[PDB]
Amino acid sequence: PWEECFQAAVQLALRAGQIIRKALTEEDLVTETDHLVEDLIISELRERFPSHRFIAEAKCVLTHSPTWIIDPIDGTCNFVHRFPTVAVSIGFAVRQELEFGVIYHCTEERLYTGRRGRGAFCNGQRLRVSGETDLSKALVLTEIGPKRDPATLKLFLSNMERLLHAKAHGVRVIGSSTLALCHLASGAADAYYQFGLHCWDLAAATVIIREAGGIVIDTSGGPLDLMACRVVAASTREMAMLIAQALQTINYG
Amino acid sequence: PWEECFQAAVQLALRAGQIIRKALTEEDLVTETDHLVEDLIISELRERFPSHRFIAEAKCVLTHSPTWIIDPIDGTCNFVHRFPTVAVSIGFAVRQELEFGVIYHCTEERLYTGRRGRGAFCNGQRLRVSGETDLSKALVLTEIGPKRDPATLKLFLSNMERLLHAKAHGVRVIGSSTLALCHLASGAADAYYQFGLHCWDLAAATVIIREAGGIVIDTSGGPLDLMACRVVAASTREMAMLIAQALQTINYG
């Protein structure tokens, strides 16, 4: 698939961002809009492409038929706290390979879109990653998984410690893996990494991060594995490795 | 002092944000705008209030005469990386006590202003902190100091570890202490904490964080000390303590 679905996704992404931007208007039970958004998006594509499959929130089991990997609201915590960093992400795959991705920054109203072989764009502007190969001039982004047990957050702190020790020019934790991947998608950041993020968070962000220079691999260096809750994206393969090589396998799924 | 200076600060903050928003337009030597901004701001107030003193970037030595504590650009790193989170902060003090504060989010165009006894406002909207007393429902913000030696970033990771362990509902690192303090200033965040941040970073943010419920104290619980590169702000005295009590003295100045 191509064009028709891509346009449908954009329009849904936008309509969605609106309902969630609006939902943010006033004063933990607003996990209803999440549904409403996912409900809006899916009930419509499921009615326009009846043969398609849908992946959202074991479950993630990607087939060869065109499937939509959707994250109605990335950053619920931000949302529940009205911290203006939340998104809607719609990625589309066919033949078990990511075709396009659409990500809307609801409050800032930034629409990141990337179609394979067609490049990446954020509100009309064509995104290009940075060329940053030196991990000492890198601006690394990350997210603290959903866990909290002393064991998992032992390698978390240490892993961040390694990057910091690595003389890392700076690390940011914005609470929205998708939007963080979108910063890397543009000049904004030089690399992202994490464990515990699901397939619907990197589905769309990867088509973009790729269509704009960038590289998305496994926390091992190996090829990207949607099923494994782990990823490492960066401006260049150089950086993509120094980060991965310096990481330490934690365990999510 | 009061009114006249406050208006002058707003206008300078705005004009400043513009030059820096504009400076962000295109493709590490743009540490000139920093000067230009600080130069603009100071050369004008120093010409409108000749008897005033100015504090900016030992140095911080606050007197009883009206002095301006200025941070021309908070978040140079973000700036150097075009990560859309950078600010201009202008705080004003008289009688060794903070009178008002003005903070401009250059890209988002958000103008946080707070005058003691007159409350806090962000673009006309009146800010109020959250009521969050439970550290398990808190959204904590922080910043990694400018250091990197293994010792200082031993308590950093551990201190964050303690909050996380404390079952902290979430932690964010946006690279802009002022703007983070402004999120806490509004509903956005429930608490902030850090070591290694200078007096010009919390000068203005404190008048605001206070004029909106909020509390700003020392990482010890004691009263706020501008001179010490350390602060702990929060929605309520409850939270303000759990955070402080669980911290571990690091050392900056």
- Residues of chain B with Cβ-Cβ distance to A150 below 8 Å are 165
> Which CATH architecture fits A128-253?
3-Layer(aba) Sandwich (3.40)
Confirm whether A57 is a catalytic residue.
yes
A47 catalytically annotated? no
Angle, in degrees to the nearest 10, between helices A199-211 and A177-185: 10
Annotated catalytic, A76?
A: yes
Half-sphere exposure of B134 (CA within 13 A, CB side): 4
B7 marked ligand binding residue: no
For residues B24 and A159, give the distance between their C-alpha atoms in angstroms, rounded to a whole number: 32
The reply to whether B250 touches chain A by the CB within 8 Å rule is no
Edge-first strand order for the sheet with B87-94 is: B53-55, B67-74, B87-94, B97-105, B110-115, B120-122, B125-126
- Catalytic one among A201, A208, A217, A250? A201
Q: What residue of A is the nearest CA neighbor of B163?
A: A148
Integer Cα distance of A92 and A228 in angstroms: 18
DSSP string, A158-171: HHHHHHHHTT-S-E
CA B220 to chain centre: 19
The first and second tokens of residue B243, run together, are 């955070």
Domains of chain B, residue spans: 1-127, 128-253
Check CB contact under 8 Å for B81 and A108: no
d(CA A209, CA A79): 24
Token pair of B209 as six digits: 């964080």
A10-47 b/e with 16+ CB inside 10 Å = b?
bebbebbbeebbebbeeeeebeebbebbbebbbeebee
Interface test with B, best of A27, A152, A157, A186 (most B CBs within 10 A): A157
Residues contacting B51, CB < 8 A, separation 6+:
B65, B66
Of the candidates A74, A103, A105, the residue with the CA atom closest to the CA atom of residue A91: A103
Q: Which amino acid is at B209?
A: I
Q: Say if the Cβ atoms of B83 and A169 lie within 8 Å.
A: no
- Dihedral of CA atoms B25, B31, B35, B40 in degrees, nearest 10, equals 10
In whole angstroms, give the CA distance from residue A56 to residue A88.
Answer: 12
Q: In this complex, is the C-beta atom of B84 within 8 Å of any C-beta atom belonging to chain A? A: yes
Q: How many CB pairs (< 8 A) connect A and B?
A: 80
Query: Does the distance separating the beta carbons of A165 and B150 come in below 8 Å?
Result: yes
Name the fold adopted by A1-127.
Fructose-1,6-Bisphosphatase; Chain A, domain 1 (3.30.540)
Of A81, A167, A173, the CB nearest to B187: A81
C-alpha distances (whole Å) from A21 to each of A14, A32, A86 are 10, 14, 9
Closest Cβ opposite residue A172 in set B130, B175, B187: B175
Beta-sheet pairing, A140-141 with A171-172: parallel
Pair A216, A249: CB distance under 8 Å: no
Query: Which backbone phi and psi does B216 adopt, to 5 degrees?
Result: -130, 120
Nearest residue, CB atoms, A174 vs list B158, B167, B174: B174
Residues in chain B: 253
Instruction: Report the gap between the CA of A83 and the closest CA in chain B (Å).
Output: 4
Residue numbers belonging to the annotated binding site of A for substrate: 57, 73-76, 175-177, 194, 201
Q: Chain B contacts of A130, Cβ < 8 Å? A: 81
Subunit contact A83:B160, Cβ cutoff 8 A? no
